[PDB]
Amino acid sequence: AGRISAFLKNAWAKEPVLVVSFSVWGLAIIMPMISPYTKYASMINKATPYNYPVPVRDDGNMPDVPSHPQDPLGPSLDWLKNL
Amino acid sequence: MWFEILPGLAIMGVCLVIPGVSTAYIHKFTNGGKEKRVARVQYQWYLMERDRRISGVNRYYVSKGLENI
Amino acid sequence: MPSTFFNLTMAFSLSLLGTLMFRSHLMSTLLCLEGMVLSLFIMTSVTSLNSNSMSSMPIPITILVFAACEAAVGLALLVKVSNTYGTDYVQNLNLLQC
Amino acid sequence: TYKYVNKKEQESEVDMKSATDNAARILMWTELIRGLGMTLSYLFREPATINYPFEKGPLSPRFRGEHALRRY
Amino acid sequence: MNLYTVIFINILLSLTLILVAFWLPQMNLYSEKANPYECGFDPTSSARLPFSMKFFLVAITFLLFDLEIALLLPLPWAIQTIKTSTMMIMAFILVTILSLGLAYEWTQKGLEWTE
Amino acid sequence: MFFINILTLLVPILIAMAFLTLVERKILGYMQLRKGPNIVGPYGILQPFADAMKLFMKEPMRPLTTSMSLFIIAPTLSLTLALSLWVPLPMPHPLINLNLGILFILATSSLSVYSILWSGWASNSKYSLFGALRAVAQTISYEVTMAIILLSVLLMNGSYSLQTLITTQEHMWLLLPAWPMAMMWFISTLAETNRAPFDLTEGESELVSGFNVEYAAGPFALFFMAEYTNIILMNALTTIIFLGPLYYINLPELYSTNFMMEALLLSSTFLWIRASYPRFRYDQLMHLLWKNFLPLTLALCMWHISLPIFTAGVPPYM
Amino acid sequence: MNNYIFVLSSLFLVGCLGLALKPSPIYGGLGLIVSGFVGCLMVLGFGGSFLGLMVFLIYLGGMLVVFGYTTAMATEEYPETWGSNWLILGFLVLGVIMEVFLICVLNYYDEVGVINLDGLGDWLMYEVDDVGVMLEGGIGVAAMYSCATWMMVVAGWSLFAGIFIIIEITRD
Amino acid sequence: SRAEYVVTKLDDLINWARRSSLWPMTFGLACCAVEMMHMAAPRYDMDRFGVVFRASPRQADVMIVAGTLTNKMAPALRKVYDQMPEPRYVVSMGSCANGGGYYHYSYSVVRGCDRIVPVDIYVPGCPPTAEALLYGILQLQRKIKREQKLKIWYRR
Ligand SMILES: CCCCCCCCCCCCO[C@@H]1O[C@H](CO)[C@@H](O[C@H]2O[C@H](CO)[C@@H](O)[C@H](O)[C@H]2O)[C@H](O)[C@H]1O
Ligand SMILES: CCCCCCCCCCCCO[C@@H]1O[C@H](CO)[C@@H](O[C@H]2O[C@H](CO)[C@@H](O)[C@H](O)[C@H]2O)[C@H](O)[C@H]1O
Ligand SMILES: CCCCCCCCCCCCO[C@@H]1O[C@H](CO)[C@@H](O[C@H]2O[C@H](CO)[C@@H](O)[C@H](O)[C@H]2O)[C@H](O)[C@H]1O
Ligand SMILES: CCCCCCCCCCCCO[C@@H]1O[C@H](CO)[C@@H](O[C@H]2O[C@H](CO)[C@@H](O)[C@H](O)[C@H]2O)[C@H](O)[C@H]1O
Ligand SMILES: C/C=C(/C)[C@H](O)[C@H](C)/C=C(C)/C=C/C/C(C)=C/Cc1[nH]c(OC)c(OC)c(=O)c1C
Ligand code: SF4
Secondary structure, X not given: OOHHHHHHHHHHHHOHHHHHHHXXXXXHHHHXXXXXXXXXXXXXXXXXOOOOXXXXXXXXXXXXXXXXXXXXXXXXXXXXXXX | OHHHHHHHHHXXXXXXXXXXXHHHHXXXXXXXXXXXXXXXXXXXXXXXXXXXXXXXXXXXXXXXXXXXX | OHHHHHHHHHHHHHHHHHXXXXXXXXXXXXXXXXXHHHHHHHHXXXXXXXXXXXXXXXXXXXXXXXXXXXHHHHHHHHHHXXXXXXXXXXXXXXXXXX | OXXXXXXXXOOOOOXXXXXXXXXXXXXXXXXXXXXXXXXXXXXXOOOOOOOOOOOOOOOOOOOXXXXXXXXX | OHHHHHXXXXXXXXXXXHHHHHXXXXXXXXXXXXXXXXXXXXXXXXXXXXXOOOOHHHHHHHHHHHHHHHHHOOHHHHOOOOOHHHHHHHHHHHHHHHHHHHHHHHHOOOOOOOO | XXXXXXXXXXXXXXXXXXXXXXXXXXXXXHHOOOOOOOOOOHHHOOHHHHHHHHHHHXXXXXXXXXXXXXXXXXXXXXXXXXXXXXXXXXXXOOOOOOOXXXXXXXXXXXXXXXXHHHHHHHHOOHHHHHHHHHHHHHHHHHHHHHHHHHHHHHOOOOOOOOHHHHHHOOOOOOOOOOHHHHHHHHHHHHHHOOOOOOOOOOOOOOOOOHHHOOOOHHHHHHHHHHHHHHHHHHHXXXXXXXXXXXXXXXXXXXXXXXXXXXXXXXXXXXXXXXOOOOOOOHHHHHHHHHHHHHHHHHHHHHHHHHHHHHOOOOOOOO | OOOHHHXXXXXXXXXXXXXXXXXXXXXXXXXXXXXXXXXXXXXXXXOOOHHHHHHHHHHHHHHHHHHHHHHHHOOOOOOOOOOOOHHHHXXXXXXXXXXXXXXXXXXXXXXXXXXXXXXXOOOOOOOXXXXXXXXXXXXXXXXXXXXXXXXXXXXXXXXXXXXXXXXXXXXO | OHHHHHHHHHHXXXXXXXXXXXXXXXXXXXXXXXXXXXXXXXXXXXXXXXXXXXXXXXXXXXXXXXXXXXXXXXXXXXXXXXXXXXXXXXEEEOXXXXXXXXXXXXXXXXXXXXXXXXXXXXXXXXXXXXHHHHHHHHHHHHHHHOOOHHHHHHOO
């Protein structure tokens, strides 16, 4: 706890490439854990529509599936417009 | 003096702009005054092939608008 | 596709003939083991592309991954064979008959 | 009398202020940028060239050149 | 087709300059002109003899690291997956074992050239 | 109309390559307190054409110990790959539009190392073999980091298409979010192109001329045209990737003019660098790249993998 | 253009014939580059792209190393070339005769099964999603980071262990 | 005739290219080679005449013999000269090279480099001043200017 500071100052003086390399390596593993945006990375990738959204046959027990795309139901990308 | 380097540096400059300008214009001259269509994925290639078929002159860049229906 | 696999498969056979028919250098026999990896990789790549099986396209990469390791391990051994007799001739590797 | 050209081991302590200076020297290539500066300054100096054969290098009256036989 | 045309055009220029270089000059061949160069004296031995490679271990370590490039080059497509946590974890580990492999070789004097 | 488009690429480049030889000799001149060429034409502008003509009237060499097939192939390959590296470059619209342009540049660049290897080996001379085995050592040095550096930059770009870098840099140079990789990228390009302080394959001081010591006349001219074309291309590539020129869809002429100014400036820094530094030792080139750049590049690869994830800044696929 | 793929696979075949006759590893490394390049063009013709350029990239770095090892360990005074020895020169020529014979023969006794010279080109691409977007081989290869993560574990471990393996093999 | 005129101007064209690109071989023997380095120095800047030193005799046009030629070095000088591609020119610079100079009567000195190679221009001095060498170099360009190879081929 006291010797480490001496070592770190020593390495930082004479080996900054490695001190920078470990810091950036370790800073890259923390930043996803604590950022409040890491969750959107999946969401934005899931919100990109490559395949055709094949419609489903409306039996009659679908009260939360839009009929027309401009219906007030279904997944919405407002969180992405205002992101 | 040092500005006597410029006569060669200016030639080299003119030479390096001919590639970019000539290619941009040649693309417009061979694509009906439009940028050469880029096709990265199969979907875009399909659009060009459809445009080539409905043009009437077998060229994808001869667009047909509401005149045609 | 039919004509391509026949030519690719015969390409693999020629390298298997090359590997099984030694000459002097051990390095030359190592290059035939890379002729075989290249033939197999191209067959797998064409098979997967023709059948549209995207989930099999990882496999051709692993073949290259596990083919380099052999090339590395093969070259590492070739260094030890050269450090002993000063060449890589196979005819020198014959002490073990007795 | 003699002097040391490459002796300096009167070792000091690496302060955090000084360690960060050594690192910036190493990471930012500062002394290599100083050398780039010296050749940039020379680019805007007047060249020392003379326009031979229209200009000639200076010579003195003692200059030993080609031989000759003189008269009275 | 364009990409085939432009490269034949490149090849034909390189060929065309090669032909002019050999059939245009006036050539005067004799043995002492066409001997190998070695700073003014005769070579003491052919140049085909073994040439020790003092960095051979790094050479084969280049192969192993070269194939580990082949595993990282799909990443631009991989960051398009829904399974972002998985993609990232696999990426971090892959780069970390390449680094751990590099550290071991560095500390074993593996990066040093054999004397 | 496509053949005319090759002319307006391969000819301006070749003219620009030649004058780079003149700009090199005059910038090196004034940096050394002299004038460089200025007699052969107004300020030497004809000096490049004199050197070319003289080299193609010089007797070509066919050494008795040489392997002629590869001896001839090597310079031909050298100049072909130098010109072929140019066809995908977007300025701002490329001659050949490739989805994986960056890999085409990586793969073409690597294959050009074999012109050094084959020529040196085919010369069957000791100094040419020393030069070839430095080409092997130099490539093993910079190859691993150079590819990974590109990977790091392309995770902000989204693809291996070169034309998509124009759109990535619409509002900002990639030099800012990436100046550590640009610094490491720039040094790699000096190693890729055998440029001082990394002219180890040639290295006139230690090897008389390295790989091309047995080459004279027009075959030797082709090697140089290749060397100086690559300088422009690698700096042209660095201008696209990191110093994104202004692109307005209505003013494609603006992008080319700005692209040229930055490519000329970066090409000058190669000439500036050659006048300023001593030459590396080729064992120390490996240590520079493997013990400094590589540890940093792996960390930056891991930094830039995570960076789009925790800022939700993943580039689009298209 | 209907013979295009057939010619590339024919060139690939020769490159491995020349390779099998095993001249000096300087030329054996030259055949692998040209076969590597030819084979790269085949994977491109069939619609690949990432797989084509990778096998070309990987074999460019492999032959660089192999060249360094040839000049140090597998070089003799008079390196052999395909024309160096009359006997090898015989089997390279004869080898090309055989393929011109095998293709012509096997084409005579089936006409469609193996070699269908009558129909070269008609059967290169079978299907293709004409309105697709996500079809590059890179997407399939990139599945190692999500779906076939097991592929990458064994691949990464293979390379990781290899560093330890070679350092011990070459150790003094 | 018209063809004989065209051949004349083609002769000037090829000469001009050889006049304007003389690449001397990096090669000096003794004190005369120090003054050859001064001619490359800024004040005279031979580079401004298109004169570039190249190390390899294959890439060199001109061999400047700048110092004493001893018997031990005589075969080696001839060998690098033979390996110069043609056309090729020799400038003999200094008394030592010109005729032995201060060592003419030495048992170990070649009494003039022109016993070993053909010499185009002789530059007197011990050493010649850098201008004297420069005058000699520029006197070699005028010699090339008077070259008449193509015209003589026409009259064969
Ligand atoms: C038949 C046409 C079809 C193509 C044929 C070629 C297929 C590829 C074969 C590769 C192997 C060559 O097979 C070759 O066999 C010969 C014996 O004949 C052996 O070669 C050995 O003996 C021969 C004969 O004296 C020597 O010339 C040679 O230097 C020596 O190494 C090797 O083991 C192998 O190099
Ligand atoms: C042996 C070698 C080992 C050394 C290397 C170790 C690397 C370990 C890296 C751990 C980092 C994983 O970091 C983890 O990222 C994921 C996604 O990226 C985050 O996960 C978050 O985002 C995802 C999508 O992005 C959401 O779907 C999820 O619900 C949410 O939790 C986690 O909150 C964070 O903890
Ligand atoms: C490295 C060496 C590479 C050389 C490789 C060989 C290149 C030449 C390719 C030979 C392959 C067959 O090449 C050609 O194929 C076509 C169709 O594809 C055959 O068939 C063609 O003619 C037949 C009639 O015979 C018709 O049905 C039709 O016009 C066409 O199918 C031709 O008879 C043959 O000439
Ligand atoms: C002792 C030596 C071995 C120790 C080291 C190896 C440890 C294992 C690490 C690799 C883990 C792979 O983990 C495995 O991933 C696959 C996909 O990637 C998951 O499998 C999944 O595949 C696809 C995902 O699209 C689904 O269609 C499928 O239904 C589902 O099971 C498994 O549920 C998980 O177990
Ligand atoms: C690099 C390119 C250039 C244009 C350079 O500017 C200059 C012009 C070339 C130089 C320096 C040498 C040219 C020829 C040569 C080999 C000289 C012999 C020599 N060389 C010495 O040192 C270098 C000596 O040192 C005491 C000597 O005694 C002797 C006798
Ligand atoms: S002539 Fe004079 S200056 Fe020249 S080498 Fe001889 S002694 Fe030295």
